[PDB]
Design a protein around this nucleic acid. Structure first.
Ligand SMILES: [Mg+2]
Ligand SMILES: [Mg+2]
Ligand SMILES: [Mg+2]
Ligand SMILES: [Mg+2]
Ligand SMILES: [Mg+2]
Ligand SMILES: [Mg+2]
Ligand SMILES: [Mg+2]
Ligand SMILES: [Mg+2]
Ligand SMILES: [Mg+2]
Ligand SMILES: [Mg+2]
Ligand SMILES: [Mg+2]
Ligand SMILES: [Mg+2]
Ligand SMILES: [Mg+2]
Ligand SMILES: [Mg+2]
Ligand SMILES: [Mg+2]
Ligand SMILES: [Mg+2]
Ligand SMILES: [Mg+2]
Ligand SMILES: [Mg+2]
Ligand SMILES: [Mg+2]
Ligand SMILES: [Mg+2]
Ligand SMILES: [Mg+2]
Ligand SMILES: [Mg+2]
Ligand SMILES: [Mg+2]
Ligand SMILES: [Mg+2]
Ligand SMILES: [Mg+2]
Ligand SMILES: [Mg+2]
Ligand SMILES: [Mg+2]
Ligand SMILES: [Mg+2]
Ligand SMILES: [Mg+2]
Ligand SMILES: [Mg+2]
Ligand SMILES: [Mg+2]
Ligand SMILES: [Mg+2]
Ligand SMILES: [Mg+2]
Ligand SMILES: [Mg+2]
Ligand SMILES: [Mg+2]
Ligand SMILES: [Mg+2]
Ligand SMILES: [Mg+2]
Ligand SMILES: [Mg+2]
Ligand SMILES: [Mg+2]
Ligand SMILES: [Mg+2]
Ligand SMILES: [Mg+2]
Ligand SMILES: [Mg+2]
Ligand SMILES: [Mg+2]
Ligand SMILES: [Mg+2]
Ligand SMILES: [Mg+2]
Ligand SMILES: [Mg+2]
Ligand SMILES: [Mg+2]
Ligand SMILES: [Mg+2]
Ligand SMILES: [Mg+2]
Ligand SMILES: [Mg+2]
Ligand SMILES: [Mg+2]
Ligand SMILES: [Mg+2]
Ligand SMILES: [Mg+2]
Ligand SMILES: [Mg+2]
Ligand SMILES: [Mg+2]
Ligand SMILES: [Mg+2]
Ligand SMILES: [Mg+2]
Ligand SMILES: [Mg+2]
Ligand SMILES: [Mg+2]
Lengths: 145, 124, 102, 63
RNA sequence: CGUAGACGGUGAGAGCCCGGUACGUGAAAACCCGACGUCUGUCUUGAUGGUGUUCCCGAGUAGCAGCGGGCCCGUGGAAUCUGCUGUGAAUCUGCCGGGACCACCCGGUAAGCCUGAAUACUUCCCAGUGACCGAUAGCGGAUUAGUACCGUGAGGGAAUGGUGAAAAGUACCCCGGGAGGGGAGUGAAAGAGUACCUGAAACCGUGCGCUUACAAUCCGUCAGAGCCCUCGACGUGUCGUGGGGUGAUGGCGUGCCUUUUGAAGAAUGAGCCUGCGAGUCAGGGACAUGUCGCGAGGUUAACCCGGGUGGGGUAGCCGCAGCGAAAGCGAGUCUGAAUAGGGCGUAUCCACACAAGAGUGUGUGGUGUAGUGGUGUGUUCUGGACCCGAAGCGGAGUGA
RNA sequence: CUGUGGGUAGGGGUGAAAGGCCAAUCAAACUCCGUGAUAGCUGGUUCUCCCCGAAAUGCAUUUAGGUGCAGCGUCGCAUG
RNA sequence: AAGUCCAAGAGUGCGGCAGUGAGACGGCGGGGGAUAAGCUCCGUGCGUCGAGAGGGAAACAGCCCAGAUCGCCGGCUAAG
RNA sequence: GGCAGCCAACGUGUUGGCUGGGUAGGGGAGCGUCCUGCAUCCGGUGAAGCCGCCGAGUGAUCGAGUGGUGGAGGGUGUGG
């Protein structure tokens, strides 16, 4: 019978903490900081480079702008549709969400990467060209909502 | 969990002060001063355990030399002759023979001198 | 999973018992419960799992030194592993099985 | 408190699909008349950050 | 015995000795919460169409302009909100918002007022809790404590707990002016005597053993005569597989720390002991690395319900497709006139063709892709951020 | 000259002017608070053993007794 | 092409954690200085010290010999 | 003759080869202190603390080995 005193952490789970400044037999005296200078008593900011124009200032800003109104799509490849629906069937957004192929509230576009061997009626917000071809050529329908 | 230091702290103090019995003045009485001397004392002891081997050999050699020269042979020729005769007695026991049994030492000197080359100062 | 592991360890060692009631009627009696628990287990620490409503059973065992009383919805690894034996009211055992296995 | 990302670094560096940190090159903003097109071409486009600078830039981007 | 085995106390570990505890029970009066009346209001004719260049719909207001304030927004293309100073409208075709502005649609109806709950806090009172402190700690304050004391003043600001179960606190005698002590008593103990539990160290004595007044000593170390003590066997002392104390004399030998190219250094710090005094903690923070759960999925936040550590809670978050300034396209995409060449991307490998020996590439097939949530550790971020230390800078007061 | 009583207060007072004096403190009083001010500077940082083990160079720097990156250490993984 | 190869505890790449960025003297090749300095500034798969105890150099970080895992009242040598 | 690290060789932990000066510094493994979950044991027939003796471990240190003092708590194992 297992009791409370039988409960042990897993091998390698717990590591003893390092306690600096506790004698010369360990990390004593300077506690790993060496001697004198800024670093003996404080940390140096990551942005600082000694006065030289920092990397994050001498390089140009990346070109362009971000479109506030961008519509981004969650994507499913038809090769995933094969594995998730071996029987084929009707595959709407609800079916893709239940099958773990897309996140639940998202706009879905279907893409052509995988091979499609199964007849599928696919309903999604958008299709790639190659997705159109694979859905139709296996004898299925591609309806965009 | 506030921890008082005395229980743990006193242990090393008692050890050091026990080891420093017989020292003079502050070195027997005060932990900090006794600790300092203990550093030297154990350094000296380590060094002298090494040096002791040379010091005893020095003593044995001196005693062997006196007994050899009382038998009309120098130390260096005695050691040469004993090597040539193949006598493997070391200097600790050679000195004990020189003190405790002069007759046995004399017999060893005769063996050594016989095994010496005819002309010690000749090539080869 | 930790709770299931703890309960499985007791079950394999036959340390799980089931009972209709700790005492008969509507009057708490520590003497009755002590005798009855003595018939079930002779070990010192016992976890008694009773439904919320069974005040008379809870009160009857409450004062016994090694006995700990818990409702089945509050069942937890620490109290199971601390006990030598787990004693379930039938209602509490069924309630635990139902809430989990359904 | 949440770690704050460095504003200027996040405007100058980008991550690729595999996590490589990329940047644009300096010396292409002005004074272009005397610069041959071969020089301006070499300076065009993006480039992977040097291994020496990777660790600091990662820290600035992550927080 | 137990619906009571909470926690204390009592001459040492008490469910059954005591206060209590579980559980029950109780209020004259005052106060507080109700319910019920009185009492006070209020209402009692409403539905239903038509009709119109009719009237009304919150004015020094909105708007506008100048200078400001505040909004993610530091004057910016700067909307919305708002102060002061000018100027100053319309009553529904009205007017104000939908980030300059205009048009069109949509939303709303400014310049009148009131409004419970969910939220914040605890001087004070009641009941409890602690992998909180235990007398240099914890409040400054267990002791007359904001006292003594310091300062003209604002203001600063301490130190001091333990006899014993019970005071049974030592009658009486002796030395002494007392103080203090010695007998005698009390007590289990005065090796508990109001200087009081335990009673460490520095520091100061007395006694005994060895040693030391011809010697140049970082004070010790390794050899070591002599003496003293002790444990064995033997015999009168003498030797041993011995053990201690002291130590004539010989060799060797330049404190510790900090900081320095280099310090015994005549560089810094330390009179001595005891006690105290420095990498800590918070956050679904960041990177990495252990470990555990689940796994193409992992996980909940707030919150809800349990006297708990348990159950519930899908909003989110992180993986799952990339490329591109972006529109966008998508296992590709961007650049470009290129079916050109590059960039980035298509987990990783294996076999087979087809082109290249210009670095090998391009197609078919297979093999399949690992993340995420706890938690240990290292580093890091924002905070005092390992600890101590300025000269000085503000705000509000106190002083001739 | 002096008693008594009174008035002027901190970037302010007062000064037959010395930056004198303003409660033993004055080239800007004292007290509390912001506050554990900030110090690229000085000091300090406490138990043990086992394995490995540097640097005092280069470049840049309102930089030269500071710091960033590289060089040189160590631990892990990979490649042998 | 071989050697070393129960390892130099070697190289190379990536990642965690550093420290260091005041050097000294000696040999050899040089600048500055008066072919002065225990001077100063460079070079050197040069050395030692730094961070190295032991032996030698009377004493004597930087020269000569030699790299201390511990014990021994064994033996042989190095510089001298 | 004892200890240790790396590696090899086999075995259900021993044998062998090589290696073990070290500051800044990295990594690994431990000693002692207090408070606690659980499990056990000792204590007015004398706990802790303190002073000794006689001994012990490679180190921090240890003694559920024992005298003295003392008067109420303490030890051990495994976790936090
Ligand atoms: Mg922690
Ligand atoms: Mg150190
Ligand atoms: Mg120190
Ligand atoms: Mg220092
Ligand atoms: Mg320095
Ligand atoms: Mg430094
Ligand atoms: Mg910052
Ligand atoms: Mg020798
Ligand atoms: Mg341009
Ligand atoms: Mg051009
Ligand atoms: Mg009790
Ligand atoms: Mg209106
Ligand atoms: Mg503004
Ligand atoms: Mg508008
Ligand atoms: Mg109001
Ligand atoms: Mg005390
Ligand atoms: Mg106090
Ligand atoms: Mg004053
Ligand atoms: Mg006064
Ligand atoms: Mg007593
Ligand atoms: Mg006293
Ligand atoms: Mg006392
Ligand atoms: Mg004399
Ligand atoms: Mg002399
Ligand atoms: Mg000498
Ligand atoms: Mg100097
Ligand atoms: Mg140094
Ligand atoms: Mg000095
Ligand atoms: Mg001196
Ligand atoms: Mg100085
Ligand atoms: Mg001094
Ligand atoms: Mg200023
Ligand atoms: Mg001030
Ligand atoms: Mg006044
Ligand atoms: Mg006056
Ligand atoms: Mg003047
Ligand atoms: Mg004055
Ligand atoms: Mg000033
Ligand atoms: Mg502040
Ligand atoms: Mg400071
Ligand atoms: Mg080494
Ligand atoms: Mg500059
Ligand atoms: Mg660096
Ligand atoms: Mg420098
Ligand atoms: Mg330099
Ligand atoms: Mg140099
Ligand atoms: Mg020089
Ligand atoms: Mg060296
Ligand atoms: Mg030397
Ligand atoms: Mg010889
Ligand atoms: Mg020679
Ligand atoms: Mg071995
Ligand atoms: Mg070593
Ligand atoms: Mg060695
Ligand atoms: Mg170190
Ligand atoms: Mg202990
Ligand atoms: Mg007694
Ligand atoms: Mg205790
Ligand atoms: Mg622990």
């Amino acid at each position: 019978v297992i009791k409370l005193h039988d409960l042990k952490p897993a091998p390698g789970e717990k590591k003893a903490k390092t306690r600096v400044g506790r004698g010369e037999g360990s990390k004593g005296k300077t506690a790993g900081r060496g001697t004198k200078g800024t670093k003996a008593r404080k940390n140096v900011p990551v942005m600082f480079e000694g006065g030289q124009m920092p990397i994050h200032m001498r390089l140009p800003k990346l070109k362009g702008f971000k479109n506030r109104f961008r519509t981004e799509y969650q994507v499913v490849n038809v090769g995933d549709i094969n594995k998730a629906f071996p029987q084929g069937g009707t595959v709407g957004v609800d079916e893709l969400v239940a099958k773990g192929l897309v996140r639940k509230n998202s706009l879905v576009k279907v893409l052509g990467d995988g091979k499609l061997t199964v007849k599928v009626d696919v309903t999604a917000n958008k299709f790639s060209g190659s997705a159109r071809e694979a859905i139709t050529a296996a004898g299925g329908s591609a309806t965009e909502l | 969990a506030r921890v008082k230091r005395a229980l743990n702290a006193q242990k090393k103090r008692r050890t050091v002060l026990k080891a420093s019995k017989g020292y003079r003045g502050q070195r027997s009485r005060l932990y900090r001063k006794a600790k300092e001397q203990q550093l030297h004392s154990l350094t000296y002891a380590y060094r002298d355990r090494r040096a002791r081997k040379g010091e005893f050999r020095k003593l044995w050699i001196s005693r062997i030399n006196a007994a050899a020269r009382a038998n009309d042979i120098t130390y260096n020729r005695l050691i040469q002759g004993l090597k040539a005769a193949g006598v493997e007695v070391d200097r600790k026991n050679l000195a004990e023979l020189a003190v405790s049994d002069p007759a046995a030492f004399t017999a060893l000197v005769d063996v050594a001198r016989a095994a010496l080359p005819e002309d010690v100062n000749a090539p080869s | 999973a930790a709770l299931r592991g703890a309960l499985s360890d007791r079950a394999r060692n036959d340390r799980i018992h089931a009972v209709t009631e700790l005492v008969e009627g509507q009057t708490p009696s520590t003497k009755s419960a002590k005798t009855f628990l003595g018939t079930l287990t002779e070990n010192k620490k016992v976890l008694v799992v009773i439904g919320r409503t069974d005040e008379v059973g809870a009160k009857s065992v409450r004062n016994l030194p090694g006995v700990h009383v818990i409702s089945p919805d509050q069942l937890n690894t620490y109290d199971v592993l601390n006990a030598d034996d787990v004693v379930f009211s039938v209602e509490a055992l069924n309630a635990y099985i139902s809430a989990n296995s359904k | 408190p949440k770690a704050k990302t460095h504003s200027g670094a996040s405007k100058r560096f980008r991550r690729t699909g595999t996590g490589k940190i990329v940047r644009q090159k300096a010396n292409r903003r002005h004074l272009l008349e005397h610069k041959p097109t071969k020089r301006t071409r070499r300076l065009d486009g993006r480039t992977t950050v040097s291994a020496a600078d990777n660790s600091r830039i990662n820290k600035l981007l992550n927080g």
